[PDB]
Tab-separated table of all heavy atoms in Angstrom:
chain	number	residue	atom	x	y	z
A	32	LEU	N	10.504	-1.067	3.341
A	32	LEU	CA	9.444	-2.190	3.212
A	32	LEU	C	9.578	-3.075	4.466
A	32	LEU	O	10.485	-3.930	4.370
A	32	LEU	CB	9.616	-2.928	1.992
A	32	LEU	CG	9.716	-2.169	0.592
A	32	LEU	CD1	9.994	-3.067	-0.649
A	32	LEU	CD2	8.434	-1.322	0.279
A	59	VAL	N	4.280	-4.341	4.795
A	59	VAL	CA	3.840	-5.676	4.325
A	59	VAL	C	2.916	-6.285	5.452
A	59	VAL	O	3.000	-5.907	6.638
A	59	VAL	CB	5.033	-6.571	4.014
A	59	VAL	CG1	4.566	-7.803	3.182
A	59	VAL	CG2	6.180	-5.840	3.286
A	60	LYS	N	2.078	-7.238	5.084
A	60	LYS	CA	1.482	-8.205	6.015
A	60	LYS	C	1.364	-9.594	5.269
A	60	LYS	O	1.497	-9.639	4.064
A	60	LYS	CB	0.090	-7.735	6.508
A	60	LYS	CG	-0.969	-7.377	5.411
A	60	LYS	CD	-1.117	-5.914	5.147
A	60	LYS	CE	-1.873	-5.231	6.300
A	60	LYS	NZ	-1.911	-3.782	6.153
A	87	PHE	N	4.773	-21.246	0.457
A	87	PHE	CA	5.177	-20.038	1.186
A	87	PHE	C	3.972	-19.067	1.420
A	87	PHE	O	2.994	-19.094	0.676
A	87	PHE	CB	6.298	-19.391	0.398
A	87	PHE	CG	6.116	-19.309	-1.192
A	87	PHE	CD1	5.120	-18.345	-1.654
A	87	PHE	CD2	6.876	-20.094	-2.034
A	87	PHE	CE1	4.915	-18.389	-2.974
A	87	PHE	CE2	6.684	-20.013	-3.466
A	87	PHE	CZ	5.664	-19.147	-3.877
A	88	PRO	N	4.111	-18.156	2.490
A	88	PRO	CA	2.992	-17.370	2.956
A	88	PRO	C	2.713	-16.281	1.829
A	88	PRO	O	3.691	-15.688	1.322
A	88	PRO	CB	3.367	-16.790	4.200
A	88	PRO	CG	4.924	-16.743	4.136
A	88	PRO	CD	5.201	-18.012	3.311
A	89	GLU	N	1.499	-15.942	1.479
A	89	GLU	CA	1.147	-14.907	0.555
A	89	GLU	C	1.371	-13.497	1.322
A	89	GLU	O	1.521	-13.478	2.504
A	89	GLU	CB	-0.299	-15.068	0.037
A	89	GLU	CG	-1.344	-15.265	1.187
A	89	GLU	CD	-2.785	-15.076	0.794
A	89	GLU	OE1	-3.045	-14.139	0.071
A	89	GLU	OE2	-3.597	-15.781	1.288
A	90	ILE	N	1.395	-12.432	0.490
A	90	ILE	CA	1.484	-11.083	1.015
A	90	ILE	C	0.184	-10.338	0.699
A	90	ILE	O	-0.385	-10.595	-0.397
A	90	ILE	CB	2.729	-10.264	0.569
A	90	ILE	CG1	2.894	-10.319	-0.992
A	90	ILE	CG2	3.969	-10.922	1.270
A	90	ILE	CD1	4.009	-9.382	-1.532
A	91	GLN	N	-0.128	-9.305	1.425
A	91	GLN	CA	-1.301	-8.551	1.302
A	91	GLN	C	-0.776	-7.062	1.215
A	91	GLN	O	-0.414	-6.349	2.168
A	91	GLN	CB	-2.338	-8.639	2.391
A	91	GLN	CG	-2.366	-9.991	3.110
A	91	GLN	CD	-2.925	-11.108	2.324
A	91	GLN	OE1	-4.054	-10.969	1.747
A	91	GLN	NE2	-2.376	-12.358	2.262
A	92	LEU	N	-0.430	-6.778	-0.059
A	92	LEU	CA	0.113	-5.571	-0.527
A	92	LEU	C	-0.470	-5.182	-1.871
A	92	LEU	O	-1.223	-5.929	-2.429
A	92	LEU	CB	1.640	-5.785	-0.653
A	92	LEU	CG	2.503	-4.956	0.262
A	92	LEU	CD1	3.906	-5.539	0.018
A	92	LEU	CD2	2.520	-3.482	0.021
A	93	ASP	N	-0.122	-3.982	-2.446
A	93	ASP	CA	-0.402	-3.548	-3.797
A	93	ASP	C	0.916	-3.561	-4.567
A	93	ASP	O	1.997	-3.542	-3.939
A	93	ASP	CB	-1.163	-2.231	-3.864
A	93	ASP	CG	-2.599	-2.552	-3.891
A	93	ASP	OD1	-3.167	-3.046	-4.889
A	93	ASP	OD2	-3.216	-2.241	-2.900
A	94	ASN	N	0.877	-3.621	-5.869
A	94	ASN	CA	2.018	-3.858	-6.725
A	94	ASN	C	2.714	-2.513	-6.928
A	94	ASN	O	2.086	-1.535	-7.276
A	94	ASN	CB	1.634	-4.447	-8.090
A	94	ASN	CG	2.764	-5.072	-8.832
A	94	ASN	OD1	3.149	-6.182	-8.536
A	94	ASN	ND2	3.315	-4.278	-9.737
A	95	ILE	N	4.095	-2.379	-6.735
A	95	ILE	CA	4.917	-1.210	-6.839
A	95	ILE	C	6.029	-1.539	-7.653
A	95	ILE	O	6.635	-2.577	-7.608
A	95	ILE	CB	5.357	-0.943	-5.328
A	95	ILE	CG1	4.141	-0.326	-4.553
A	95	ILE	CG2	6.445	0.126	-5.330
A	95	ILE	CD1	4.407	-0.163	-3.076
A	96	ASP	N	6.408	-0.510	-8.486
A	96	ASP	CA	7.616	-0.421	-9.349
A	96	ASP	C	8.751	-0.173	-8.314
A	96	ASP	O	8.990	0.961	-7.967
A	96	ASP	CB	7.434	0.556	-10.376
A	96	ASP	CG	6.547	0.073	-11.534
A	96	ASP	OD1	6.976	-0.747	-12.268
A	96	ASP	OD2	5.341	0.605	-11.476
A	97	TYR	N	9.506	-1.238	-7.945
A	97	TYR	CA	10.654	-0.995	-7.110
A	97	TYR	C	11.891	-0.508	-8.016
A	97	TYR	O	12.889	-0.127	-7.400
A	97	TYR	CB	11.026	-2.312	-6.416
A	97	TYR	CG	9.914	-2.841	-5.564
A	97	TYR	CD1	9.530	-4.155	-5.758
A	97	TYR	CD2	9.293	-2.155	-4.576
A	97	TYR	CE1	8.475	-4.726	-4.966
A	97	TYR	CE2	8.122	-2.580	-3.822
A	97	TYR	CZ	7.817	-3.944	-4.052
A	97	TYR	OH	6.737	-4.450	-3.300
A	98	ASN	N	11.732	-0.420	-9.301
A	98	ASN	CA	12.885	-0.197	-10.188
A	98	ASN	C	13.470	1.192	-10.029
A	98	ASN	O	14.592	1.440	-10.343
A	98	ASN	CB	12.430	-0.458	-11.633
A	98	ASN	CG	13.479	-1.137	-12.483
A	98	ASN	OD1	13.216	-1.927	-13.428
A	98	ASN	ND2	14.824	-0.754	-12.244
A	103	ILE	N	16.532	0.343	-0.861
A	103	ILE	CA	15.367	-0.265	-0.295
A	103	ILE	C	15.806	-0.933	0.923
A	103	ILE	O	16.585	-1.873	0.870
A	103	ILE	CB	14.652	-1.305	-1.256
A	103	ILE	CG1	14.281	-0.588	-2.694
A	103	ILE	CG2	13.338	-1.797	-0.652
A	103	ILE	CD1	13.459	-1.456	-3.555
A	117	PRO	N	8.955	-14.041	5.726
A	117	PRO	CA	8.226	-12.934	5.283
A	117	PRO	C	8.650	-12.476	3.915
A	117	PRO	O	7.946	-12.381	2.944
A	117	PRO	CB	8.194	-11.939	6.384
A	117	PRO	CG	9.595	-12.210	7.154
A	117	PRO	CD	9.762	-13.776	6.925
A	118	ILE	N	9.994	-12.170	3.821
A	118	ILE	CA	10.546	-11.418	2.664
A	118	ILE	C	10.682	-12.390	1.506
A	118	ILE	O	10.728	-11.941	0.331
A	118	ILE	CB	11.979	-10.799	3.107
A	118	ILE	CG1	11.995	-10.120	4.474
A	118	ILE	CG2	12.396	-9.756	2.002
A	118	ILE	CD1	10.863	-9.164	4.803
A	119	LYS	N	10.512	-13.762	1.638
A	119	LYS	CA	10.518	-14.767	0.615
A	119	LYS	C	9.622	-14.411	-0.574
A	119	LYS	O	10.078	-14.225	-1.638
A	119	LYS	CB	10.160	-16.130	1.323
A	119	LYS	CG	10.006	-17.303	0.366
A	119	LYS	CD	11.301	-17.654	-0.426
A	119	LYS	CE	11.387	-19.111	-0.878
A	119	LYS	NZ	10.393	-19.603	-1.825
A	120	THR	N	8.288	-14.297	-0.342
A	120	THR	CA	7.318	-14.107	-1.299
A	120	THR	C	7.447	-12.744	-2.044
A	120	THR	O	7.270	-12.670	-3.296
A	120	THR	CB	5.898	-14.133	-0.535
A	120	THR	OG1	6.026	-15.154	0.523
A	120	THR	CG2	4.835	-14.676	-1.428
A	121	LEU	N	7.791	-11.674	-1.330
A	121	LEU	CA	8.023	-10.379	-1.880
A	121	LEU	C	9.347	-10.429	-2.886
A	121	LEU	O	9.178	-9.859	-3.992
A	121	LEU	CB	8.319	-9.364	-0.723
A	121	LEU	CG	8.836	-8.055	-1.182
A	121	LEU	CD1	7.798	-7.232	-2.036
A	121	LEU	CD2	9.198	-7.219	0.101
A	122	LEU	N	10.302	-11.089	-2.543
A	122	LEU	CA	11.479	-11.174	-3.307
A	122	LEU	C	11.251	-11.780	-4.723
A	122	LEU	O	11.740	-11.296	-5.677
A	122	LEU	CB	12.645	-11.854	-2.606
A	122	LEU	CG	12.982	-13.337	-2.841
A	122	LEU	CD1	13.916	-13.595	-3.969
A	122	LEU	CD2	13.595	-14.062	-1.632
A	123	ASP	N	10.335	-12.799	-4.713
A	123	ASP	CA	9.962	-13.542	-5.911
A	123	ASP	C	9.199	-12.487	-6.932
A	123	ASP	O	9.407	-12.640	-8.185
A	123	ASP	CB	9.058	-14.668	-5.609
A	123	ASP	CG	9.183	-15.833	-6.537
A	123	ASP	OD1	10.094	-16.639	-6.354
A	123	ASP	OD2	8.374	-15.950	-7.590
A	124	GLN	N	8.635	-11.487	-6.476
A	124	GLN	CA	8.055	-10.410	-7.193
A	124	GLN	C	9.193	-9.446	-7.639
A	124	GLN	O	9.052	-9.029	-8.792
A	124	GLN	CB	6.924	-9.703	-6.441
A	124	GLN	CG	5.685	-10.566	-6.269
A	124	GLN	CD	4.409	-9.721	-6.060
A	124	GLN	OE1	4.084	-8.902	-6.891
A	124	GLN	NE2	3.688	-10.000	-5.019
A	125	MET	N	10.122	-9.074	-6.812
A	125	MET	CA	11.116	-7.984	-7.149
A	125	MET	C	12.486	-8.445	-7.699
A	125	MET	O	13.371	-7.584	-7.943
A	125	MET	CB	11.305	-7.210	-5.846
A	125	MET	CG	11.816	-7.884	-4.625
A	125	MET	SD	13.041	-7.007	-3.611
A	125	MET	CE	12.046	-5.689	-2.917
A	126	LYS	N	12.630	-9.697	-7.941
A	126	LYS	CA	13.920	-10.394	-8.355
A	126	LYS	C	14.655	-9.748	-9.473
A	126	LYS	O	15.927	-10.129	-9.553
A	126	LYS	CB	13.668	-11.821	-8.620
A	126	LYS	CG	14.147	-12.805	-7.558
A	126	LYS	CD	15.233	-13.739	-7.920
A	126	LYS	CE	14.804	-15.227	-7.967
A	126	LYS	NZ	13.795	-15.457	-9.059
A	127	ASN	N	14.154	-8.947	-10.386
A	127	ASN	CA	14.814	-8.478	-11.516
A	127	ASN	C	15.303	-7.069	-11.461
A	127	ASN	O	15.868	-6.543	-12.368
A	127	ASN	CB	13.899	-8.736	-12.748
A	127	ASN	CG	13.704	-10.178	-13.147
A	127	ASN	OD1	14.473	-10.675	-13.963
A	127	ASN	ND2	12.830	-10.859	-12.421
A	128	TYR	N	14.995	-6.384	-10.308
A	128	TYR	CA	15.471	-5.012	-10.159
A	128	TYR	C	16.899	-4.951	-9.677
A	128	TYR	O	17.527	-5.917	-9.334
A	128	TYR	CB	14.489	-4.313	-9.191
A	128	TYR	CG	13.027	-4.309	-9.700
A	128	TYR	CD1	12.051	-4.916	-8.835
A	128	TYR	CD2	12.773	-3.876	-10.894
A	128	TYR	CE1	10.674	-4.959	-9.282
A	128	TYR	CE2	11.437	-3.986	-11.467
A	128	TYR	CZ	10.434	-4.533	-10.602
A	128	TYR	OH	9.119	-4.614	-11.134
A	129	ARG	N	17.360	-3.711	-9.512
A	129	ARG	CA	18.659	-3.358	-8.997
A	129	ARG	C	18.515	-2.220	-7.979
A	129	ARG	O	17.474	-1.679	-7.854
A	129	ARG	CB	19.635	-2.932	-10.132
A	129	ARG	CG	19.781	-3.915	-11.340
A	129	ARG	CD	20.677	-5.122	-10.928
A	129	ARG	NE	20.622	-6.106	-12.094
A	129	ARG	CZ	21.010	-5.905	-13.346
A	129	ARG	NH1	21.718	-4.786	-13.611
A	129	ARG	NH2	20.703	-6.719	-14.292
A	157	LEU	N	19.026	-10.218	-5.216
A	157	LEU	CA	19.259	-8.769	-5.317
A	157	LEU	C	20.499	-8.385	-4.537
A	157	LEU	O	21.062	-9.106	-3.644
A	157	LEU	CB	18.006	-7.987	-4.624
A	157	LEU	CG	16.650	-8.017	-5.316
A	157	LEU	CD1	16.593	-7.310	-6.593
A	157	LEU	CD2	16.051	-9.353	-5.343
Side-chain angles (χ1 to χ4, degrees):
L32 307 177
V59 194
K60 60 254 288 169
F87 41 68
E89 51 163 318
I90 54 173
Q91 333 285 316
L92 246 173
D93 268 291
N94 198 80
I95 288 172
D96 285 288
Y97 303 125
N98 214 144
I103 305 186
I118 319 311
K119 177 58 156 69
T120 326
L121 171 64
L122 98 88
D123 212 84
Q124 292 204 56
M125 63 140 66
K126 255 246 249 67
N127 290 269
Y128 303 124
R129 307 280 176 64
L157 291 294

